[PDB]
């Protein structure tokens, strides 16, 4: 596997997935254990909690990453506030590609949930979300989306040209230019038989943004009814 040096730099910033899955699983199981039968978290609450924990992991990943760590705090804030949901979605979708299987949903805890259940025990807005998500997963599986391509898309999502009032906008332009070039070099050399892999991967970014927005609206509605676990990171990003 020929890998551009820049991508090797991006990879050194990646955490151990199986480890992260277990740590979050362990913590959730620990909290439910400390609470009474009269304060047990609902499945929805538990899912929100794991999303919050995943967000923390995402913020730590970014905070320690090359390039991003060079930005002033206020710039880091602006970038993360713009893409937090996109990263959560990209994180979820990649997990489906690597650990999931057709017909089921693989959670960050390592738990798997059949789609049939969701289609009969969930509302229209959520099923619509899962459907689109499922479409995206099917496309990445088809392309044999891999870790090198995954980290490139993460940086392209993080360093968004759409973010305004950034002090160091040049760094965003640089990441966009160089990571796009690195991704193209990578796909051309390792998946030559897929002449359009680079382009097909980029076409997924707008779809990821679209799904993230739909996901936010969904959570926002729950938020208004005060049903989402609060006093956490998930809620602050949503309430913003």
């Amino acid at each position: 596997a020929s890998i551009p040096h820049l991508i090797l730099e991006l990879l050194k910033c990646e955490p151990d997935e199986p480890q992260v899955q277990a740590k979050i699983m362990a913590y959730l199981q620990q909290e439910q254990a400390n609470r009474s039968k009269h304060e047990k978290l609902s499945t929805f609450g538990l899912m929100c909690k794991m999303a919050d924990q995943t967000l923390f992991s995402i913020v730590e990943w970014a905070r320690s990453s090359i390039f991003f760590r060079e930005l002033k705090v206020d710039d880091q804030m602006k970038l993360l506030q713009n893409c937090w949901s996109e990263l959560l979605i990209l994180d979820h979708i990649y997990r489906q590609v690597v650990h999931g299987k057709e017909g089921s949903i693989f959670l960050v805890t390592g738990q798997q949930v059949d789609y049939s259940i969701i289609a009969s025990q969930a509302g229209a807005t959520l099923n619509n979300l899962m459907s689109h998500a499922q479409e995206l997963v099917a496309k990445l599986r088809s392309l044999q989306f891999d870790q090198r391509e995954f980290v490139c898309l993460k940086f392209l999502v993080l360093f968004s040209l759409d973010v305004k009032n950034l002090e160091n906008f040049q760094l965003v332009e640089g990441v966009q230019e160089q990571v796009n070039a690195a991704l193209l070099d990578y796909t051309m050399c390792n998946y030559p038989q897929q002449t359009e892999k680079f382009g097909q991967l980029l076409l997924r970014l707008p779809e990821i943004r679209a799904i993230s927005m739909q996901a936010e609206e969904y959570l926002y509605y729950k938020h208004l009814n005060g049903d989402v676990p609060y006093n956490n990171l998930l809620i602050e990003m949503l309430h913003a």
Partner: peptide
Amino acid sequence: ASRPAILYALLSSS
């Protein structure tokens, strides 16, 4: 202001 306190606290840590 209305900025995410937890996020800000995390990014502000060395």
